[PDB]
Amino acid sequence: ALAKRIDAALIMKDGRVVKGSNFENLRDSGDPVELGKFYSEIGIDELSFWDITASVEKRKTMLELVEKVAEQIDIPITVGGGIHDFETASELILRGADKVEFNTAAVENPSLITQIAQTFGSQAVVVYIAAKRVDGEFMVFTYSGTKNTGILLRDWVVEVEKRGAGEIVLGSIDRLGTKSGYDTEMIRFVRPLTTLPIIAHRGAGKMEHFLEAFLAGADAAKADSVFHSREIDVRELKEYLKKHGVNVRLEGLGSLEHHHHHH
Amino acid sequence: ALAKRIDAALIMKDGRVVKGSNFENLRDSGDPVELGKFYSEIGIDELSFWDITASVEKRKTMLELVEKVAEQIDIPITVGGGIHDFETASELILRGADKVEFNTAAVENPSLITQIAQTFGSQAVVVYIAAKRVDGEFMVFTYSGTKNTGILLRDWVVEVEKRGAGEIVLGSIDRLGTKSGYDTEMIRFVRPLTTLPIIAHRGAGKMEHFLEAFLAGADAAKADSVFHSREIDVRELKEYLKKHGVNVRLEGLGSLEHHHHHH
């Protein structure tokens, strides 16, 4: 009965959606702005824009993206990917981002969470936690999933809440690139450790996986390629979840129906 | 190499921090438990509690101190100062000290190093070496830096590793009470002689001195009065070292700070 959120994430490089999308109806299936706008119309609750620009153009690219997206998209927007300090995060928020996401920079300097939360409110702060099983423990990984920090998932979750984050995206490296389901064991492990919204990430391959993640205690489920490829249709997914008792947002959606000639 | 470590040392007599501290936020700025706890919440990596109590109450005082700090401090705790035998060291460990420091007693009975290491692990053993230039030679001094042992620093360093110590605190008597910098010549002299962590002590007067000590090959730098007097701020020091390319831990910065506003 608790409200659940369906989020779409867009991976970006040099201003393009990486690997694009299969929405042939779009003018440019690799334009993040057009794809994001489209997702808002068909039923996505929130968008993440995750930047992996590796050139010296990364900061500028991210700022320009936020400006273009906040122009045209009315649903909540999170921006993330290598946001390394207060100044950079503050600018992105001022530029129109509703939320900024930290990972590596916050793990190394958790004060950054508090600094943004103090200025803009907890609700403006998302922490993405990338976690993997190592020798029977859930461990926190930084640097695009490559560095074993030695920090336990259970400790970092508590610290993230203490420092002032608004929500936690829980990304299972053990499900990276997989389509067998969300890491429900990880979600269940984290659920009693925090009162914050938990957003599941990695593993989604079919509609039933979303149901499973919600039964595990996730407040939201985020996916990317499974939507962009059209393996799962967002509206169909929401209708499926509603059918089986999950409180998703459906009434607020238009009727792409096109039935009857509304002028 | 491991991240460079910043340690604060508290010199205590009769249960009080000698010359106290300038932290007006504390209930008792000369209470070692409260001061140690505060350091642990602002960015100090490890603590040393050094006792110079002269009375019959020395043993009781040290054990009670360790019990208190263990209760409520999560960072590694070293206790030292006139620890003379295995039983005293063992009681302090079993009481909650993570590491015990030897100086004079180790020089006069190096097997004491091995005894503690064999029972508790080498990581529980710290040897403080006080050294001074004497007629063109680095020599080891015992009894609070007053007795020339005639033992060369080079020989004692090698012996200390052989006997199983976990780390060496290298305290330059030539920098006693000074603020001109750590004895980087001494640190450079010792560096190739041992595989153990070398912790610089004596001479620190400004943040740049810590950088110099790490360039000299120290794995950690310990200071006392320069911190207690607030001549150097711990957070400023960590941020300074990070700025200039040193790998230091920022995870503990701002732990007492929050994202609300108390007027």
Side-chain angles (χ1 to χ4, degrees):
Chain A
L2 295 174
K4 305 303 186 182
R5 210 173 77 202
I6 308 303
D7 297 351
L10 286 64
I11 294 285
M12 28 198 48
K13 193 157 183 308
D14 306 321
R16 301 297 297 163
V17 180
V18 176
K19 302 180 178 181
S21 73
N22 284 341
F23 297 106
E24 71 281 5
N25 54 302
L26 298 182
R27 298 299 301 276
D28 186 353
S29 57
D31 182 356
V33 173
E34 194 191 5
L35 181 57
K37 179 59 163 60
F38 173 76
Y39 272 133
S40 62
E41 296 166 347
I42 70 182
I44 286 298
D45 297 312
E46 298 200 5
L47 289 155
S48 293
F49 297 91
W50 287 337
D51 180 272
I52 62 170
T53 301
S55 70
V56 282
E57 306 279 329
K58 171 175 179 83
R59 181 179 180 274
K60 165 187 289 193
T61 297
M62 290 182 70
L63 281 163
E64 289 175 317
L65 173 72
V66 170
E67 193 158 0
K68 293 176 179 177
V69 166
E71 183 65 13
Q72 338 197 25
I73 289 170
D74 293 338
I75 64 175
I77 293 143
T78 299
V79 298
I83 299 173
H84 61 300
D85 58 28
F86 179 83
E87 277 303 324
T88 301
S90 174
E91 283 310 302
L92 289 161
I93 294 173
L94 291 174
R95 202 68 80 91
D98 300 281
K99 300 187 254 191
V100 285
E101 178 189 292
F102 291 121
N103 186 349
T104 301
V107 173
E108 291 184 3
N109 188 8
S111 179
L112 287 178
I113 295 165
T114 312
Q115 295 171 34
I116 293 290
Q118 179 171 307
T119 306
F120 298 98
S122 293
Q123 90 294 321
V125 180
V126 175
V127 178
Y128 189 107
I129 305 180
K132 184 176 178 164
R133 297 157 177 80
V134 180
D135 301 321
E137 294 176 325
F138 288 121
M139 305 302 291
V140 178
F141 281 64
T142 50
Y143 295 96
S144 296
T146 64
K147 172 175 170 78
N148 183 343
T149 64
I151 300 165
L152 296 174
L153 176 61
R154 52 175 167 89
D155 293 334
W156 182 226
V157 164
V158 174
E159 186 70 31
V160 163
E161 181 171 345
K162 178 178 169 190
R163 292 285 184 159
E167 63 183 36
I168 289 173
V169 184
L170 188 58
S172 178
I173 299 175
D174 292 322
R175 296 300 183 271
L176 185 60
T178 73
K179 305 292 167 188
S180 58
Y182 286 106
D183 193 337
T184 54
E185 185 197 344
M186 188 186 288
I187 296 163
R188 288 175 185 276
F189 174 88
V190 171
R191 183 70 278 171
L193 308 183
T194 181
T195 70
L196 297 181
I198 297 173
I199 307 123
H201 187 230
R202 304 205 193 281
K206 66 197 187 170
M207 292 184 308
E208 296 90 334
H209 294 160
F210 289 77
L211 178 62
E212 293 165 358
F214 295 135
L215 293 174
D219 300 287
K222 194 182 307 285
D224 40 54
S225 61
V226 76
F227 296 144
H228 307 332
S229 66
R230 303 187 64 205
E231 290 187 320
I232 295 179
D233 181 85
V234 172
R235 182 57 180 274
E236 289 186 351
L237 167 63
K238 281 187 156 184
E239 293 285 351
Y240 169 84
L241 295 166
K242 210 63 177 198
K243 178 178 170 180
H244 302 290
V246 180
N247 183 11
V248 292
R249 312 272 60 70
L250 267 176
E251 292 182 345
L253 274 61
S255 188
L256 188 147
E257 335 300 345
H258 192 112
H259 255 281
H260 325 114
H261 294 83
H262 200 305
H263 68 287
Chain B
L2 240 59
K4 304 299 192 182
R5 202 177 88 200
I6 306 291
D7 297 353
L10 282 63
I11 289 78
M12 317 171 298
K13 195 176 180 286
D14 313 314
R16 309 290 303 161
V17 181
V18 173
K19 293 180 181 181
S21 82
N22 283 334
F23 294 107
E24 309 296 324
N25 55 299
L26 305 179
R27 186 177 166 150
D28 190 352
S29 60
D31 171 17
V33 174
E34 192 185 6
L35 181 61
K37 174 67 173 182
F38 172 73
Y39 276 132
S40 75
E41 297 276 42
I42 68 167
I44 286 298
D45 301 313
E46 298 199 12
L47 290 159
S48 291
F49 296 90
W50 288 336
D51 179 275
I52 62 172
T53 300
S55 75
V56 60
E57 316 296 335
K58 172 181 180 70
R59 181 179 180 274
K60 285 180 284 230
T61 299
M62 295 181 70
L63 292 162
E64 296 296 340
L65 179 278
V66 164
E67 181 178 341
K68 291 156 95 17
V69 303
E71 253 170 40
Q72 72 176 259
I73 300 191
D74 225 355
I75 64 172
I77 295 169
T78 301
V79 66
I83 301 178
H84 65 296
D85 60 19
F86 177 87
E87 178 179 28
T88 303
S90 169
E91 288 290 329
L92 287 160
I93 292 298
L94 297 169
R95 201 68 46 117
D98 304 289
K99 300 177 186 172
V100 156
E101 176 186 295
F102 293 116
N103 188 345
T104 300
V107 174
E108 301 192 356
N109 180 15
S111 68
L112 182 49
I113 297 165
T114 309
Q115 294 169 33
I116 296 289
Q118 287 176 345
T119 303
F120 297 105
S122 287
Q123 80 297 321
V125 185
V126 179
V127 175
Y128 190 106
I129 303 173
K132 186 188 172 180
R133 296 161 175 77
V134 174
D135 299 316
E137 299 265 42
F138 288 118
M139 286 290 186
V140 175
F141 281 66
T142 49
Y143 297 96
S144 297
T146 66
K147 173 176 182 60
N148 187 349
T149 68
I151 305 176
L152 288 166
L153 175 58
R154 49 178 204 83
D155 294 338
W156 183 228
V157 165
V158 168
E159 182 71 12
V160 159
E161 180 172 343
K162 176 180 177 180
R163 294 293 171 199
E167 58 183 37
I168 291 171
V169 186
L170 190 61
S172 176
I173 291 169
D174 293 313
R175 298 296 183 273
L176 184 62
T178 74
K179 305 295 161 169
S180 61
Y182 286 107
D183 195 339
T184 55
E185 190 196 349
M186 189 189 284
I187 299 169
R188 289 175 187 277
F189 177 86
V190 173
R191 181 70 279 175
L193 308 178
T194 181
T195 67
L196 299 179
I198 293 169
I199 302 97
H201 187 232
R202 305 207 190 278
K206 61 191 184 175
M207 297 189 293
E208 293 91 335
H209 293 159
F210 290 78
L211 176 61
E212 291 166 358
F214 296 137
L215 294 175
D219 303 286
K222 198 180 317 279
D224 40 54
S225 60
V226 76
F227 291 146
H228 313 325
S229 68
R230 306 182 66 177
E231 286 166 5
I232 297 177
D233 179 82
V234 173
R235 180 170 193 165
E236 292 184 357
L237 175 61
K238 288 282 195 75
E239 291 171 341
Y240 168 86
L241 296 166
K242 186 69 181 178
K243 176 175 176 185
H244 298 296
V246 187
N247 178 14
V248 289
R249 293 189 82 262
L250 310 173
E251 294 93 343
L253 299 184
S255 295
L256 302 177
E257 297 174 348
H258 56 74
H259 60 297
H260 315 292
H261 298 89
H262 199 304
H263 72 288

